[PDB]
Design a binder for this molecule. Structure first.
Ligand code: YGI
Ligand code: YGI
Lengths: 180, 180
């Protein structure tokens, strides 16, 4: 299925390559100017919106999630690209206008592929199937990461479905953060 | 199908985002120290090996394809990653130990997802199906790029299937280059 392949692609072509090196990058940042602040958490927080809406700025999604810093970028030779670069961004989570947590955080971009395929008629992908494909993407990624030696206790899947309109993305992440 | 999704992912999540900006990056490089050399071609050359073997160094694949330079990297905010970086590499193609062409060149990494899925039993993907999925990936990508407004005359798909062992990847690319 589409989402089956997208989840394997997300692991094979991305997470398997950055997760083995994430813990060291995070420690280098925490050991850096950051002297008086709380340490960045050790896991990649991956936002999995089941509506497949992947905006490019998280502060648009919630002004309680504000960008703090970029992690030291990782480079590797990949598929003929010398020094292919992996950047990741650090966000602070605000709770009543005070810092309640700090983590590397991003959206699972393959969900945007499902969104776009549902928009383009040439994809032969129905809007009405997108929700179940997004759930299947998340379930498959969970299945993979449970057994994968790279992704062992250094990412956190945050899946959610917005209503009512009363939704706090920051509270979703904070729920997962403080359970460690 | 798996490869259907992978081809839409490759376009939506990558090619649609770098191709609109490639021509300007290539011109900036050609207008740069490069004063006496031939200009880099205007298209992204995408290697599509139907055996799904995506090595990380092209000089391993053929010593007649040798790395020349990195293009000026492109950055954009993406899915919560500030200044997500797209690097691409420039290769020269040798013919009888003289430069016969110069182009931006890389492998279509989603083919490596098919390769890996055929290797991992949890993917439920048979080795015997990989060849037809790789062909379907290429066919779908061609179908997409024909209609896509981004990818109009700025990439070149190089699909091939090695035997005999007598195969020249450099000659494949040079065939496509000199037809412009
Ligand atoms: C084969 C695949 S899936 C996938 N998903 C997210 N990726 C990222 S983060 C933000 C982005 O998509 O640009 N960087 N590479 C990937 C990537 C790759 C390279
Ligand atoms: C969603 C997808 S597919 C895909 N295919 C190749 N991509 C590249 S080149 C080399 C690489 O894979 O790392 N950079 N991003 C991608 C990419 C992304 C971000």
């Amino acid at each position: 299925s589409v989402a089956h392949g997208l989840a394997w692609s997300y692991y094979i072509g991305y997470l398997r390559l950055i997760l083995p090196e994430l813990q060291a990058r995070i420690r280098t940042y925490n050991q850096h100017n950051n002297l008086l602040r709380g340490a960045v958490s050790q896991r990649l927080y991956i936002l999995l919106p089941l509506d497949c809406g992947v905006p490019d700025n998280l502060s648009m999604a919630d002004p309680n999630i504000r960008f703090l810093d970029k992690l030291p970028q990782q480079t590797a030779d990949r598929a003929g690209i010398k020094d292919r670069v992996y950047s990741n961004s650090i966000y602070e989570l605000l709770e009543n206008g005070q810092r309640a947590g700090t983590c590397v955080l991003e959206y699972a971009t393959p969900l945007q592929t499902l969104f776009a395929m549902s928009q383009y008629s040439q994809a032969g992908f129905s809007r009405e199937d997108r929700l179940e494909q997004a759930k299947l993407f998340c379930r498959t990624l969970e299945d993979i990461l449970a057994d994968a030696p790279e992704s062992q206790n250094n990412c956190r899947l945050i899946a959610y479905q917005e209503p009512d309109s009363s939704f706090s993305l920051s509270q979703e992440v904070l729920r997962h953060l403080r359970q460690e």
